[PDB]
């Protein structure tokens, strides 16, 4: 009666998802069907594993809650942080992005590296009272800060030249300059390297080693490969 035996012998996977991340787990509001990376990713080990899903919704607020407290059996990806870990389990990762820059390409051979972009001649976009924020303050200590109000966007300053650039997620980052081919990413690394995985309970450790094995075999397959490109997911490596 180990949590996959469970799933096994009861042939549901329970799926705890918010629907609302674009690419990775989207709710359509039509169709009620979900689709994107995640759902991908969970249609296959339930395809694998013999059983239906199950999709709970959750929101980013309850999430982890929702694993600790049994809501669902595993998590769509969320970020793997040492808070987390200490209250739920995490499946192995299959994506990796970070914190990078954004400034328009016309300025991109003048702001080719973070350092250039902590200068009191540069202004910096950020979101007023965001940890986005705190973190632009990290790294360019030095620098001006165009800090707008939510909803206002950080990247919008820079498309508007009111700031010389922003920095966001390399996910994020890679949607918007092909959403503004006018950006582009400063090609001097990512900060701050993050990891997206699944969630399980901290109880359900045989689960949790099922899971990890079966992602390392799809990693071998190339099944993460395949996905990643679907979506124009760009996992640092």
């Given at each position: 009666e180990s949590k996959l035996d469970q799933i096994l012998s009861s042939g549901e996977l329970k799926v705890g998802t918010t629907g609302d991340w674009?690419?990775?787990?989207?709710?359509?509001?039509?169709?009620?069907?979900?689709?994107?990376?995640?759902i991908d990713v969970m249609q296959e080990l339930a395809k694998d594993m013999g059983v239906k899903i199950t999709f709970v919704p959750t929101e980013w607020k309850t999430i982890v809650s929702g694993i600790t407290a049994g809501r669902y059996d595993i998590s769509t990806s969320v970020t793997k942080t040492p808070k987390r870990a200490e209250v739920a389990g995490f499946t192995d990762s299959y994506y990796k992005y970070g914190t990078v820059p954004l400034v328009l390409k016309k300025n991109l051979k003048k702001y080719s590296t973070w350092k250039s972009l902590n200068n009191k001649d540069v202004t910096i976009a950020t979101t007023l009272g965001t940890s986005q924020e705190e973190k632009a303050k990290e790294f360019f200590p030095l620098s001006k800060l165009q800090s707008v109000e939510s909803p206002a966007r950080d990247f919008q300053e820079v498309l508007a030249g009111r700031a010389d650039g922003n920095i966001t997620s390399s996910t994020e980052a890679n949607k918007l300059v092909v959403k503004y081919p006018q950006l582009a990413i400063v090609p001097d690394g990512e900060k701050n390297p993050a990891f997206l995985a699944m969630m399980v309970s901290k109880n359900d450790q045989v689960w949790n080693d099922y899971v990890n094995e079966w992602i390392k075999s799809k990693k071998s397959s190339g099944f993460f490969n395949k996905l990643l490109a679907k979506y124009n997911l760009k996992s640092l490596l």
């Open positions: 674009d690419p990775m787990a989207m709710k359509d509001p039509a169709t009620n069907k979900y689709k994107g990376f995640d």
